Design a protein around this ligand. Structure first.
Ligand SMILES: [Mg+2]
Ligand SMILES: [Zn+2]
Ligand SMILES: [Zn+2]
Ligand SMILES: [Zn+2]
Ligand SMILES: [Zn+2]
Ligand SMILES: [Zn+2]
Ligand SMILES: [Zn+2]
Ligand SMILES: [Zn+2]
Ligand SMILES: [Zn+2]
Ligand SMILES: [Zn+2]
Ligand SMILES: [Zn+2]
Ligand SMILES: [Zn+2]
Lengths: 203, 205
């Protein structure tokens, strides 16, 4: 397909309760992140993500939601190679045990994204990793974090999505051909950040 | 499914660590009821890291002492720790050299090695990152019966640097492995099984 078509197909997939495989630039991370809307991701989708992802399952959120939840950025002097926007980590205050099962990570995501969520609904630290997206989305920063928020908002959801990088069992990160094969195995749409940037520049 | 005394289980685990094998550490059934795969930070292989990500939560942690935390200038992640188990997460880390994105098994190992190197400085680690240090409480399992303290105590008793990598064993269906699954897993992977209770008994003696 074309770039705009891949974006459109990705929005349909998110609306249908399917995941999307998001590939960033080859000259950047060259990684594929599986993403789901925070509002609809299931425990089975979370199990899938832990099984075949890095297991570092992230919750992409806006600056306003970060402030609503009172989640400081993890560090002041961000020296990460890619400037990744990790906040302090989180666990649901209620409805979990140790916080790390697929079910507990989903409970934590739902507590964080609920309308009216308050800081006391989350304990810290925890086993879910929120990432704060920059305003302007992929028009500001071409990361998976912004890409996730932009796809959610374009699909009609709250600007809140769950992401994890796809990993091969031998410990190497999946490259684009592996990400596309995996997307086929799990009926996910595939889209690139480059597609998304072009789409938003036009639209 | 158990054999022998607590003391032998501990000694078997020390041998396993020296031999380059993992240890499966079970905490109290009334605490987390979880088994963590553990390896010395010094000798853990890329293959072992890949095994840990594949079978574990993927939240692979590096147990360190307070002295090492200070040496690396790693703040505790939160001032007011409200976690269910009071887990000692510091700010997260990535090697400043010799990695790409930080997340591959190879890159996580590189990061662990950078953090534990003799003479490691704060500038050897970028923050935040894909490896999660856990700071052990003074007194080890005699103060806090956690996987973090168990790891440090085991490495210490085995003769290693007080630094160990851990991750909780996860079933493929996303539920956490309980003792029977952890014991079966450890058997299949030639990891020595030991309980925090065993280790408390050993250290008190
Ligand atoms: Mg735990
Ligand atoms: Zn159009
Ligand atoms: Zn699967
Ligand atoms: Zn599978
Ligand atoms: Zn705002
Ligand atoms: Zn844990
Ligand atoms: Zn990314
Ligand atoms: Zn599937
Ligand atoms: Zn295995
Ligand atoms: Zn990552
Ligand atoms: Zn240096
Ligand atoms: Zn534990």
């Amino acid at each position: 397909g074309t770039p705009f078509e891949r974006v459109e197909l990705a929005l349909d997939a998110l609306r249908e309760g399917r995941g999307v495989m998001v590939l960033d630039d080859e000259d950047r991370e060259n990684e594929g992140d599986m993403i789901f809307p925070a509002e609809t991701m299931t425990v089975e989708q979370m199990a899938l993500t832990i099984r075949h992802g890095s297991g570092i399952v992230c919750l992409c959120i806006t600056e306003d939601r970060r402030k609503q939840l009172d989640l400081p950025m993890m560090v002041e002097n961000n020296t990460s190679a890619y400037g990744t926007g990790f906040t302090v980590t989180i666990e649901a205050a209620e409805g979990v045990t140790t916080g790390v099962s697929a079910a507990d990570r989903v409970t934590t995501v739902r507590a964080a994204i609920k309308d009216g969520a308050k800081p006391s609904d989350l304990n810290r630290p925890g086993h879910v990793f929120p990432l704060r997206a920059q305003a302007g989305g992929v028009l500001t920063r071409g990361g998976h974090t912004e890409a996730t928020i932009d796809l959610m908002t374009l699909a009609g959801f709250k600007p809140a999505g769950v992401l994890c990088e796809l990993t091969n069992d031998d410990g190497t990160m999946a490259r684009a051909p592996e990400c596309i094969a995996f997307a086929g195995q799990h009926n996910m749409a595939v889209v690139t950040i480059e597609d998304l940037v072009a789409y938003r520049q036009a639209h």
